[PDB]
Design an enzyme around this catalytic site. Structure first.
Site: not given
Ligand code: ZN
Lengths: 83, 47, 286, 83, 83, 83, 83, 83, 83, 83, 83, 83, 47
Positions: G23, G59-61, G64
């Site tokens: 990230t 980007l953070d799928a 998380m």
């Protein structure tokens, strides 16, 4: 006591090797742009070299701490005393 | 617990999702289709 | 009932195959279903896929049979929009005059979209409805056909068979084997080109084989992950706690709103990749 | 106490390292663009230096946290006290 | 129980070291373009600084979660009570 | 002490391998920029070569330190004497 | 039992550390390009910010998901029940 | 000396593999700029080739000693002489 | 059997963390280039966004396969069934 | 012996895998710049190709040594005789 | 047989995770240049798209083999049964 | 013995995964540069494609050997015979 | 997971659906669209 000594040797190896790798890559990146800038502005080279040294002071800050800690581990091993 | 709770949770979430869809996704598609129909009608009227 | 048993039951397909006493009967347990060899059928996957395909074909046949050639109706306007989109996609990728490519692309896109769409329904609705209708509480029933690797593999294998058929049709077995063993690296003299045929084969056969595998797995991974995450969130509701259920609702809503985009995108990617693969079988790329 | 101290040595090594590595690579990347900027417009150097230091603080925050925790693990040990 | 604590130490070392490496590299990449934009458009630096801070807020989130979890492991080890 | 020896071999392998990797990548970057500068301005080569050597010394310092440490471990193993 | 808990601690560390590293690097790249665009076209900043947020959503799928799984492993534990 | 020889095999593997990876990356980076310079103006190719060879002499310096000591470990093992 | 579960935990951790890292870096690159393209030609923004989503459809495949397989490995286990 | 042969398998895997990874990345970097140069001036392509081959030799010099050593280890294992 | 299955789990995790990371990074690199090409010359888009889809067949060829053999290991473990 | 085949599984995973990662990244770079060249000069595509395949062969050279060795290890394990 | 003959049934259904669509769906819609475009063109050439 063999496990502690072996793992401290591995620790020293990691401590020096990772710092060496990072320092080499970072200084390659810095030096490439320094050469590009020197070629672009030959008259500003005396200032660019000083700025490069200033940046180099920050680049090697943690690497020297790691090297010092590795030397302290290999010559004055504190983990042998069970701390 | 377990059954009769999972069903309620799923129904609530699905109802919220259906409301979101019926309020945001359907009207743009309907509008686009009707605009296509209106443009075809205008072309036919001109012809 | 435990959460692990809940997930394990949700992960099993309705299987019909050869029992030890005869080639007839449905499996009642996962072990019994796995005991059946290659000659078994997942009834729920085939039934749903055939039903959705028939529904799509019937709906598109209704509009096509009464094409007005004037002001379009509500349904046939939508059908014309889909046909125009598929034709525009085919025209920009394929420059031949093969009549098979465009209806194939349309069928693939709409069928895969309809198969993916049923993942948006709550996970416990259709299995419980089937269990109540059939009267069996411990009934295996999985609705989403694209989360079964057999369906995606069948689609990819049929596309691969079409690729091979059209390549052979347009180049002869001669040009087919020539492109597979001689073309990427060529030599003016025999001795060098003989040493080059193993390299050419190793470079071409791997890429040829990798196409159906990637086509199947790209869809399967996305659909399987989506359904599994949908199943896992339902367990949060099963705890009965106020705090956990409140977060579960938001998680499920966000997952569905994100999943609709994946549903559309996977079908579009499959259609485009099929078109590209079929177009490169009529030409020379090396 | 053998295993915990042996693994604490590795933990200290992995805390100081990868931190030296990231710091060196990041400072190389930053200094390259700093020299490029100072060679494009030689009169903006005083502002560029202050901005570079402002960015360097953010760059080194987590590395300094890791170095501090590694020193805490070296000259003290929260893990040995847990038996 | 020595294995649990020894592996918790390595877990903390990884949690902090990987985050430090990531933040250092990411902030080098961000600050390089920030300095380039400041040198090329010196009148837009106050806006570019605010935008860089906004981006840095997204850049450092997961690293902050990781360092919080690492501190929780070091001072309130939950794995010890699970055996 | 069968474990300490062998772990020292792994340590020296890491010490030399990481340094070699970093040195090769950094010199690739530096030499690429030097070749670009020489190819664009052939008259600047004599100064660019000296500047490249100046950068190369800083690039290779820590790698040479690591190589020396690895040789010292190979031929004059100090961890053996620590039981 | 001790091995399972010790390995799940390292699993949690791996998940969170790798997610944080990825990230941070990805957001560094995205933010650098966003700052370049903002300096290039100052009037387009409001739309570029929305596009950057849209990209950040993708980007953070997976990160998380990894963080949630790591928290589930660190608070509850599906592996201990499996014995 | 089962463990010593088993770990010496891994040490040799690291010494050769890390050097090979580093040299491949560095030579790709250098050759790319060499080809770009040759394409920009072909009249300077003879000088650019000599400069590239000079740089390659520095790039491969540590890797050759790494493979030398790897061969020195495979034949006439020095660590098995240490029990 | 405890070793099988312990190693399955680490397998899940790697399978999710590596995919998260790769997805984050790839989306950072793709989004940065998308932002540059949007900045250069504002009229082409919607077509560029559609193409970015098309590329994201290809980028995120194997990571999703890994995520699905890891989630399968956590709540089900094909390895435990082999004793 | 079991452990020495098991570690020789890992040694061969590292020797081939690291060389393959480095060769692929470096050759991609070289080929991209070769395609750019060929696009810049199509009439000089044969010279660019031969200059690309003479640097491909340098790129693969160490990887071929690594694969040769790995093949020697696989069929003529020298470590099993040192026991 | 416990160790064999446990290490097969790690083997599957590596086989899929490394391929996922590689494909994500490679597809990000490819898609970024595709978007830049589509933005610079908007009239070339369909040809660029078909060329990108052609290159995507080379990009993931080995990754598909890796994922297939990993799936083979998970459900039809060949190593079990070799004593 | 179980240890030998358990390490052989890890060896195969490394052999295939590292090659997959390398090929994916290298082909991403090569295809990105090929797409950029095609977008800049659509008339040069026929020869650019030929040169791209010429360099793709060199990309896949070593990884094909790696995957062949991995398959030979999986189906014709040569290390079990060594006892 | 479990490779079965569903792999064959799916390909059979796929081919049947594609052959249905090739003959009984696409041609009428394409012909209607082309006739409408021809009508529009003729109306635009009336001058
Ligand atoms: Zn061909």
């Amino acid at each position: 006591m063999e496990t502690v000594v072996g793992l401290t040797a591995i620790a020293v190896a990691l401590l020096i090797g990772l710092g060496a790798l990072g320092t080499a890559i970072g200084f390659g990146l810095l030096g490439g742009k320094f050469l590009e800038g020197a070629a672009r502005q030959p008259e500003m080279v005396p200032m660019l070299q000083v700025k490069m040294f200033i940046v180099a002071g920050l680049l090697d800050a943690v690497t020297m701490i790691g090297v010092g800690i590795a030397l302290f581990f290999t010559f004055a091993n504190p983990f042998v005393g069970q701390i | 617990m377990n059954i009769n709770a999972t069903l309620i949770g799923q129904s609530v979430a699905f109802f919220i999702f259906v409301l979101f869809c019926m309020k945001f996704v359907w009207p743009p598609v309907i509008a686009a289709l009707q605009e296509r129909q209106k443009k075809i009608a205008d072309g036919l009227d001109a012809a | 009932e435990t959460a692990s048993g809940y997930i394990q039951h949700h992960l099993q397909n309705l299987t019909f195959g050869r029992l030890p006493n005869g080639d007839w009967g449905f499996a009642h347990t996962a072990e019994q279903a796995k005991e059946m060899g290659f000659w078994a059928f997942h009834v729920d996957t085939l039934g749903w896929s055939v039903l959705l395909g028939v529904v799509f074909l019937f709906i598109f046949r209704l509009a096509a049979k009464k094409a007005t050639s004037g002001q379009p109706g509500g349904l046939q306007n939508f059908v014309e929009v889909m046909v125009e989109f598929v034709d525009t996609s085919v025209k920009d990728t394929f420059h031949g005059r093969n009549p098979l490519i465009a209806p194939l692309a349309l069928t693939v896109f709409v069928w895969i979209f309809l198969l993916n769409l049923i993942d948006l329904v709550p996970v416990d609705y259709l299995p419980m409805l089937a269990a109540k209708i059939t009267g069996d509480e411990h009934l295996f029933f999985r609705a989403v056909a694209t989360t079964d690797p057999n369906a995606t593999l069948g689609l990819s294998i049929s596309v691969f068979a079409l690729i091979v058929f059209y390549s052979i049709k347009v180049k002869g077995i001669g040009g087919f084997l020539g492109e597979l063993t001689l073309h990427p690296f060529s030599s003016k003299n025999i001795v060098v080109q003989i040493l080059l045929i193993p390299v050419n084969f190793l470079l071409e056969f791997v890429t040829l084989i990798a196409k159906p595998v990637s086509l199947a797995l790209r869809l399967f991974g996305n659909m399987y992950a989506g359904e599994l995450i949908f199943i896992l969130i339902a367990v949060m509701f099963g705890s009965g706690m106020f705090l956990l259920s409140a977060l579960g609702v938001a998680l499920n809503w966000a997952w569905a709103v994100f999943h609709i985009l994946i549903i559309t995108l996977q079908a579009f990617i499959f259609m485009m990749l099929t078109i590209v693969y079929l177009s490169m079988a009529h030409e020379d790329n090396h």
